[PDB]
């Protein structure tokens, strides 16, 4: 075999400790660049003028941040959606002041994670597996796209994309509530049903299987040793678990089919989170949560507040305070 | 929720953060386990719809743990190899998450908040150019409190004249 | 109109309140809309000179139809709620409005997304079926069992 | 920054004590007769 053939055989080899593959060929350098830039920036980057008003925000550890407050800060509002790679700056100092690291990191990362998904398909194919784990992964991936790419496109600036940091994430969430009333949006509500529900069913499944483990051990050892990797026998009694759960609610609310059940386990959180992503991605074009402000009115016409109006008051506090020096005109239109 | 952000800075609370990690991690485990099982199924029937190729009474595993283990080992670096541990872990993560969040709320019962980082505030008070996402979010909180309190807390009879309401430029 | 010199008006941040420069120098509208300076439209272009928004044109040449058009567009921005309450998320009920641009963009993002998902689904499946393991792993011929261990 | 001066020893012991607990248990497990 020629050099290229050998190379292909290696790249796509099923025997590498970590699978490479052709998606991996793109994934590895992009994730490495995103990771390295992210770590260096988070430790040592100078303050970044996120909102383009010459008001630099400090994100790195060395410049006054801890783990909770620190961030790689989104690129300047002055840049908007312009492509700002290192070679567009006159100097690394300019690059840093304007939040170049953010763009380098999120582009390399979005590419790298997309290729991560593809790579999940690829290895499933090499191993003779069914292919749809990558489809489950598409949900968190779509979410990442929503907050790092789509929302900035819709709002016209990477300065409104989610910050790479913990407190920055909370900043993003609060401003989002102010500007879209995301809490009152049914896609976010489906997202909450998705992750609350995912958590619920995670605990439920775990507890049912654990509860019906077949006795294979003594009381002085872990029950885990009762399972051996690659044994052909199932390690728990699904009929017993179904008997239990079916009696807990009623029989036909419970799954007797393991495949059906595990399919449920995959579908609920994945679909819920798909809707979360789509919620962010469509509020990206300002189709917002339900607005029932002043919806109830008495016989004279007095406003009768509901809980929605109280929400509205909170949102107003967020709105009037956020980015306090950035607005010169009365409407915040993006 | 919004009250807890504005008054307690609840998102800053490490017990709530552990809660979030437990719920999001629970969701992740739900998704990834269900999808993994469904994609390492043995062909136990001739149907292209594969649900019928299961019998609750059957003795065999319906999917391949060995293939699953190699796949995740090569994709993510590590993988479950023990099923009992897998399912115990699935119990452990969301249950522990919710318990931690509970501890945090018990603290908020007494206004025992993780509201501030004292070092942050000392620096920012002395240095009008020092800005982080932490100080940004407190400005948001101050907005929430002042703008929501009079209607949200009617028993207090709050009257906040226009001139005292915190507001940035224009808005 | 009230007598402000909009070219020299310094805003609170030190950037122009009405007018500032783009990162490459063109004269552009100030405030947050600095992000949108790539916008081009028939009602704005007559005020545009070779270096961007032209101060003399701004001072002397703005027509009433332009004022009208800017007011109309400003007051019909593509912002609105799912039940079609026009405006920012904090606005009170009164105006029944969500932009067609919002409807079209959101609908087609949703559809494009689920169609990407569908592509992943049917591509993965078509591969698996063509290779012949779309229905599951052959117990007596499980491929991983014929591979060397990773360690 | 005016951080809490006990923060360092707090973090250090928080990490080291239980970590050391685990390392002790692990090593004496390995050394048990295979």
């Amino acid at each position: 075999a020629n050099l290229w053939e050998r190379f292909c055989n290696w790249v796509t080899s099923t025997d590498n400790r970590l699978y490479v593959g052709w998606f991996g060929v793109i994934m590895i350098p992009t994730l490495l660049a995103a990771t390295i830039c992210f770590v260096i920036a988070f430790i040592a980057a100078p303050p970044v003028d996120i909102d383009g008003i010459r008001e630099p925000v400090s994100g790195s550890l060395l410049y006054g941040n801890n783990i909770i407050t620190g961030a790689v800060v989104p690129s300047s509002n002055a840049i908007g959606l312009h492509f700002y790679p290192i070679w567009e700056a006159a100097s690394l100092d300019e690059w840093l002041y304007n939040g170049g690291p953010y763009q380098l990191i999120i582009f390399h990362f979005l590419l790298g994670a997309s290729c991560y998904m593809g790579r999940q398909w690829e290895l499933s194919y090499r191993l003779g597996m069914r292919p749809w784990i990558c489809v489950a992964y598409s949900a968190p991936l779509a979410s990442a796209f929503a907050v790092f790419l789509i929302y900035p496109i819709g709002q016209g600036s990477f300065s409104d994309g989610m910050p790479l940091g913990i407190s920055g994430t909370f900043n993003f969430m609060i401003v989002f509530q102010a500007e879209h009333n995301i809490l009152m949006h049914p896609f976010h509500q489906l997202g909450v049903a998705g992750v609350f529900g995912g958590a619920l069913f995670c605990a439920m499944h775990g507890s049912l299987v654990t509860s019906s483990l077949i006795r294979e051990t003594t009381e002085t050892e872990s029950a885990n040793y009762g399972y051996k990797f690659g044994q052909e026998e199932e390690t728990y009694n699904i009929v017993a678990a179904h008997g239990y759960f079916g009696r807990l609610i009623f029989q036909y609310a419970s799954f007797n089919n393991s495949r059906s059940l595990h399919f449920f386990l995959a579908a609920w959180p994945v679909v819920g989170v798909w809707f979360a992503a789509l919620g962010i991605s469509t509020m990206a074009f300002n189709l917002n949560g339900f607005n029932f402000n002043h919806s109830v009115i008495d016989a004279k016409g007095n406003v009768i507040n509901t809980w929605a109006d109280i929400i509205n008051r909170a949102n107003l506090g967020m709105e009037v305070m956020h980015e306090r020096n950035a607005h010169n005109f009365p409407l915040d239109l993006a | 929720l919004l009250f807890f952000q504005g008054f307690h800075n609840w998102t800053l609370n490490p017990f709530h953060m552990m809660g979030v990690a437990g719920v999001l991690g629970g969701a992740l485990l739900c998704a990834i386990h269900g999808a993994t099982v469904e994609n390492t199924l043995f062909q136990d029937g001739e149907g292209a719809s594969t649900f019928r190729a299961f019998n609750p009474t059957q003795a065999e595993e319906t999917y391949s743990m060995v293939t699953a283990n190699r796949f995740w080992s090569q994709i993510f670096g590590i993988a479950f190899s023990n099923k009992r541990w897998l399912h115990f872990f699935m119990l452990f993560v969301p249950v522990t998450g919710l318990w931690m969040s509970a501890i945090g709320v018990v603290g908020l019962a007494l206004n025992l908040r993780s509201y501030d980082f004292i070092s942050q505030e000392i620096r920012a008070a002395e240095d009008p150019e020092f800005e982080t996402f932490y100080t940004k979010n407190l400005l948001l909180n101050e907005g929430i409190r002042a703008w929501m309190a009079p209607q949200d807390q009617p028993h207090e009879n709050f009257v906040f004249p226009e001139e005292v309401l915190p507001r940035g430029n224009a808005l | 109109k009230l007598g402000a010199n909009v070219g020299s008006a310094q805003g609170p941040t030190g950037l122009g309140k009405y007018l500032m420069r783009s990162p490459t120098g063109e004269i552009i509208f100030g405030g947050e809309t600095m992000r949108f300076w790539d916008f081009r439209g028939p009602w704005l272009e007559p005020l545009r000179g070779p270096n961007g928004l032209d101060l003399n044109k701004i001072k002397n040449d703005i027509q009433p139809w332009q004022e009208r058009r800017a007011a109309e567009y400003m007051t019909h921005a593509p912002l609105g709620s799912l039940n079609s309450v026009g405006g920012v998320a904090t606005e009170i009920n009164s105006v029944n409005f969500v932009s067609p641009r919002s409807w079209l963009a959101t609908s087609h993002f949703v559809l494009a997304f689920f169609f990407l998902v569908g592509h992943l689904w049917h591509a993965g499946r078509a591969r698996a079926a063509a290779a012949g393991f779309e229905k599951g792993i052959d117990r007596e011929s499980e491929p991983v069992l014929s591979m060397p261990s990773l360690d | 920054m005016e951080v809490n001066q006990l923060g360092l020893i707090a973090t250090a012991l928080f990490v080291l004590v239980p970590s050391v607990f685990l390392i002790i248990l692990y090593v004496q497990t390995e050394s048990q007769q295979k």
Partner: peptide, 30 residues
């Protein structure tokens, strides 16, 4: 000291990733 502490814990975690992956107890079929 704070910064050193944060970066040190992070570094230990990355090293831990390395050992957990390349020096894991190998899964063995029975």
């Amino acid at each position: 000291m704070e910064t050193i502490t944060y970066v040190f814990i992070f570094a230990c975690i990355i090293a831990l990733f390395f050992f957990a992956i390349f020096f894991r107890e190998p899964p063995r079929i029975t």
